[PDB]
Amino acid sequence: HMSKAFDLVVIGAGSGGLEAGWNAATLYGKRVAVVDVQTSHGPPFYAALGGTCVNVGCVPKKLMVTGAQYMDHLRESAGFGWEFDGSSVKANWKKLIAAKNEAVLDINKSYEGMFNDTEGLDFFLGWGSLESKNVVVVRETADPKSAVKERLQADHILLATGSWPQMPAIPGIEHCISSNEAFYLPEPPRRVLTVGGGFISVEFAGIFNAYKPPGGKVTLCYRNNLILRGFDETIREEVTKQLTANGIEIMTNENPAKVSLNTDGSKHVTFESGKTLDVDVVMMAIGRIPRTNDLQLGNVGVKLTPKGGVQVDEFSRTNVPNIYAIGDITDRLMLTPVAINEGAALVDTVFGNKPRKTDHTRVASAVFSIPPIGTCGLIEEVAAKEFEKVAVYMSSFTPLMHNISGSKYKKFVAKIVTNHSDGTVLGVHLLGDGAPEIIQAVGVCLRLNAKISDFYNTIGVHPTSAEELCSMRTPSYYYVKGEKMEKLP
Amino acid sequence: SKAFDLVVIGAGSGGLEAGWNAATLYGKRVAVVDVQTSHGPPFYAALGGTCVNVGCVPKKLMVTGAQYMDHLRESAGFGWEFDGSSVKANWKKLIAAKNEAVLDINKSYEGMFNDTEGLDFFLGWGSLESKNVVVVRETADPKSAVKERLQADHILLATGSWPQMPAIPGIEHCISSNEAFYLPEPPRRVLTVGGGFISVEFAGIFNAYKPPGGKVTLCYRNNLILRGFDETIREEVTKQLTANGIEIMTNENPAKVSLNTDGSKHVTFESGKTLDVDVVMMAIGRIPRTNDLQLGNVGVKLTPKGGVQVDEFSRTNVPNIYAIGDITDRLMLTPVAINEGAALVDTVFGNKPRKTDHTRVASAVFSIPPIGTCGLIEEVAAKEFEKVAVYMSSFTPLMHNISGSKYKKFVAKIVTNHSDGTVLGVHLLGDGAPEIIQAVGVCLRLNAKISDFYNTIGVHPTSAEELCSMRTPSYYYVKGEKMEKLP
Ligand SMILES: Cc1cc2nc3c(=O)[nH]c(=O)nc-3n(C[C@H](O)[C@H](O)[C@H](O)COP(=O)(O)OP(=O)(O)OC[C@H]3O[C@@H](n4cnc5c(N)ncnc54)[C@H](O)[C@@H]3O)c2cc1C
Ligand SMILES: Cc1cc2nc3c(=O)[nH]c(=O)nc-3n(C[C@H](O)[C@H](O)[C@H](O)COP(=O)(O)OP(=O)(O)OC[C@H]3O[C@@H](n4cnc5c(N)ncnc54)[C@H](O)[C@@H]3O)c2cc1C
Ligand SMILES: Cc1ccc(OCC(=O)N2CC[NH+](C)CC2)cc1
C-alpha cells in the first residue's frame, strides 16, 4: 500500500479547515486531503466532520436556545389575548434532542457527499499528526503508538484542530460533565449547576431553565463578581438581572472546591466558601483550550505560545515555513466566522497570488442568552485607555410590547462608543430581542469607518428596536483621559 | 388673539417634531392645533398623530399578537406539548391592551405640553384665514364657531393623510383601517381590498384572531400585490400568506357592495364573481388631508395628485407657509415626517439650511413573515444604470424545517451598480428583516460596495449573515434587459 501525495493536507475538517480545503481545490485546482476523527456527531469524540460548531457548538445550541425561547413565548402570549390550558404545558426534552440530532446528521451526510464527489478534495478518517515537515501520519487513535492507516505527503500543511473544554483539577471532577455531554443528556436535569461566567455557561443555563421538570432549579456560579467578562458592563449587569428574573439563580464570587455523590446518587457540591448545593448535573464551562497535544508538534518544532496555542504571524504562518494554523488552535478569537475568514485568506495568499490577512478588529458577535446580546468593537473602558476623549451614547428602556407581555424586566440596551475627537464609532453594544440580527450590518459600518453622524443622519425604520441606533445625537457621558464624567470640562 | 413664531396645524409625527424643536432648541413661541386629545372615534387620529393613534404603534402591537398563532404551532417541533383544542385568541383583550398603551402615549404628550416653555396646544380644527393668521374652529365646517385666532410669522401644514374610498355603490357599507382598530368582535369572514402594506398587514392580523370557521380574503385589482417592493419578495410573500390560510384574489376589484338580511355584506366584483363577508376593509390608498384647511384663502398651490406643492426645503409658493409629512404626498412614513420637520426648523430658525434626503430610506412591512428593504429595486436600477448585478439567496432556515413551517423561505437580495460594485438596494423577507435592515441604511450612506459586505465577518448563526456571504451575481440587467450572463 502506497502513501498518497497532496498540495495541501488539512488536519481537522472543521469551520476553518473545510473552508481552506474547499477553496484550494475548487478555486485554485489544488489536490487537498482533510483528516478528521469521526464522520458524524456525538460520542465518543463529539466533534466530527464539519467541526465543533456543526456538531456540538453554534448550530445545535442555537436550535436548543430557540426551543427554550418558547417558554417565554407561551407565557407572553396571554398579554395579547391568547388563552389555553396552562396546566397541560410540558417541555419534552427528548423530542428537542432527537430533532437536533437529525438536523446535525443531515449536515454530516452532506459534507460526506461533498468529499465523495469533489475532484481533488479527499477525506481521511483518523487521528492526524506531524511526522516530518512534509508528511502527515493518520493513526487509528490519538495514541502515537496506535496503528498507521495512511501517510499523507504534503507540500503545505494546515493545523485546524480547534479547541476542547477545560476541566478544573478538583476532587470529584469525574462526577461533572462539559457542554459535549450536555448535548446528549437522556433527560433534562431537575437541578443543574453551570460553572462559568462565559457565554457557554450562560446559554446553557437558559436552555436548562426552560426544559427543567416541574420541581426544578438552574444555578449558575462564577468565581468573580460579574459574569460575561469582556462584554459591555451595562449589558453584563442587565443580563444578570434578566436571568434572575426568569428564575435562574446566579452565585457570584463562588467556586466549587469538590464534588461528591450523595447516597441517592445526586451530586453534592462544596464551594470554597463552605456553601453547599445538591444538584443532578454539574456542567463545567470555565474555558476552552487549543487542541495541540495529539499533533506531535515536537517532531517538527512548531512553536507554541506561553498560553498554549500555536504561534502564528498575521498570515497564519508558524515558525516552520510551510506549516500554518488557523481557528481555535491559535487561541485568539474562538468564533466560527473568524476561522473561516482565516482559512479563505490563507488559501488566497498561498495558492492565489493575492495576499490577504484577517482583520481581527471590529468583529461582530453574539450571545444567545435569553434575551440575547449583539456586539461589535470596543467596550468603553478599553477605548478610554487608547483615546483621550471617548463619548458614550446610551438608550435603555423596556419596549412597549413587553409592557403588554408582562416581561417588564426585559430592558433593551443600545450603546454606541465613539472617539469624540472625530466622531468615529469604536463599538456598538446591544441587549434585547433581535440583537444578533441587528448587529451584523453594524460590522459593515465599522469596517467602513462610520461616524456617529452617519448613524444619526440615517432615517429610522419604525417601529423597531434597531432605530434607537439612529436616534442618538448627544452623549450620555464621556471619558476624558480615562476619567468618567457626565460633561466635558 | 395670540402671537406666535410658529403655528403648527396637526400634532402628528412631523408636527410635534417641528414644534418641540422650535421651542426647546431655538427658544421660539409655538402653538400646535389638533382635533382630539386622545385616540379613537370620532376623528381617530389625535394628539400624537396617525402613527401613534391609528397607525404604526397600535398595528405593530396587533401584528405581534397575531404572530403567537405561529409560535404556538411551531413550538411543537421543539418538544412543547399542550392541549391544542384549548387554544383561543381573545380579540377583545388585544384591543383593550392596545387602547391602554395608546392612551398612555396620549397622556404623555399632554404632560409634554404642560411642562415645556413656549409650546402651547389648541383643540379644534385649524385653517388658513390669511397669510399670517390661523383660525381654530369647533368643527371641520368653515362656518362653525371660532375658538382662537392665532397670528404667526410662520405656518406649518402637517395634517397628514386619510383613507381613500372608491366611488362604488355601497361604499358606505365598507370600513377603513381607522374602524378596524376598534371592531367590537374579530370578523369571522373579512375581505381586505388593496395590494399595499396596510391591506397585507391587517390580513395577517384578522387571520390569527378569526373565530372558528373563519376566512380572510385579500383582493387586489392587478396581477401581483405589494407594488414597489422587490418582485421576488412580492411573489414569496404571496406564497407564504397563502400557506397560512389567506386567500389572495388577484386581478379582482369590487364593483359594488350591498347589505344582507343577516347584517353581512354581499360583494360583487367587476368580473361578476360574488363573495359574502362580515367586514369589507378598503385599503386601496391614502390621500393628503387638505380639504379642511381652506387653502384657497391664501392660494397655496397643490400638485395634480392633491399634495401641497413644496420645494426641497418644504416651502410652499406662499412665503412663510410650509408643508411636511403625508400632506406633501411623497414618502408616507413617520420617520420621514420627523426628519422633514427637524430640517425645516433648522433652516428657518437656525443658521443652517437642511433638506431631507428621500433616497435610500429604509422601511418595512409587518406582514407575517415581514419585509425589510432599503434603496432601489432592480427594475428601477436597470433604468438608471447600464449594468446592474443582482445577488440572491433564498432558502428555508433550519429552524423552520424543525418547526414545520417549511414554506417560510428567507429571501435576501442585494442590487448593485455592477460597473463599480456600489450597493443600490437591499431587500429582505423573513423573521427579523425589519431589524436587520436598519444598519444597511447606514451602509448606503457610506457608499458601501458589495465587496464591503462580503469582506465583513459574519455573526453566526443568523439570517443576517447571508448579506455577507454573496460573492457572485445570480443575474444582471444590461441596458435594461434581464440576462443570466454578461455579454
Ligand atoms: C458550545 C459551543 C457553542 C459555540 N457557539 C458559537 C456561536 O454561536 N458562534 C460562533 O461563531 N462560534 C461558536 N462556537 C465556537 C466555534 O464552534 C469554533 O470557534 C469553531 O468551530 C472553530 O473552528 P476551527 O476550524 O478552529 O475548529 P473546529 O470547528 O473545532 O474543528 C476542528 C476539528 O478537528 C478535529 N480534530 C481534532 N484533532 C484532530 C486530529 N489529531 N486529527 C484529525 N482531526 C482532528 C475535531 O474533531 C474537529 O472536527 C461555539 C463553541 C462551543 C463549544
Ligand atoms: C394603518 C397604518 C399603519 C402605518 N404604519 C406605519 C409604520 O409601520 N411605519 C411608518 O413609518 N409609517 C406608518 N404609517 C404612516 C404614518 O402613520 C404616517 O406617515 C405619519 O403618521 C404621518 O405623519 P404627519 O406628520 O404627516 O401627520 P400625522 O401623524 O397624520 O398627524 C396629522 C394630525 O393632524 C390632525 N389634523 C388633521 N386635520 C386637522 C385640522 N384641520 N386641524 C387640526 N388638526 C388636524 C390629525 O388629527 C392628526 O393627529 C402607517 C399609517 C397607517 C394608516
Ligand atoms: C394548537 C394551535 C396552535 C395555533 C393556533 O392558532 C389559531 C389557529 O390555528 N387559527 C387558524 C384557524 N382559524 C379559524 C383560527 C386561528 C391554534 C391551535
Ligand SMILES: [Br-]
Ligand atoms: Br423530557
Ligand SMILES: [Br-]
Ligand atoms: Br450628529
Ligand SMILES: [Br-]
Ligand atoms: Br385594489
Ligand SMILES: [Br-]
Ligand atoms: Br402588478
